[PDB]
């Protein structure tokens, strides 16, 4: 039960934390290009600040 609670439950809590952060890690890996795309509407909106 503990391994069921650990490997099949707690590791899925880790998984549901890892999967919820799986794209984070990819996004963290591609932090600048994700900023280049996911926040692409920042620099373009920055051009009209002045």
């Amino acid at each position: 039960h503990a391994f069921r609670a650990q490997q099949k439950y707690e590791r899925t809590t880790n998984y549901c934390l890892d999967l919820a952060s799986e794209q984070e890690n990819t996004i963290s890996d591609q932090w600048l290009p994700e900023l280049r795309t996911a926040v692409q509407n920042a620099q373009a909106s920055s051009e009209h600040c002045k």
Binding site: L32, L35, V39, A42, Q43, S46, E47, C49, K50
Partner: peptide, 15 residues
Amino acid sequence: SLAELSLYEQFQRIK
């Protein structure tokens, strides 16, 4: 020129 160049930094950043 300086306006468009500098403003991209924030984009770059009981039981």
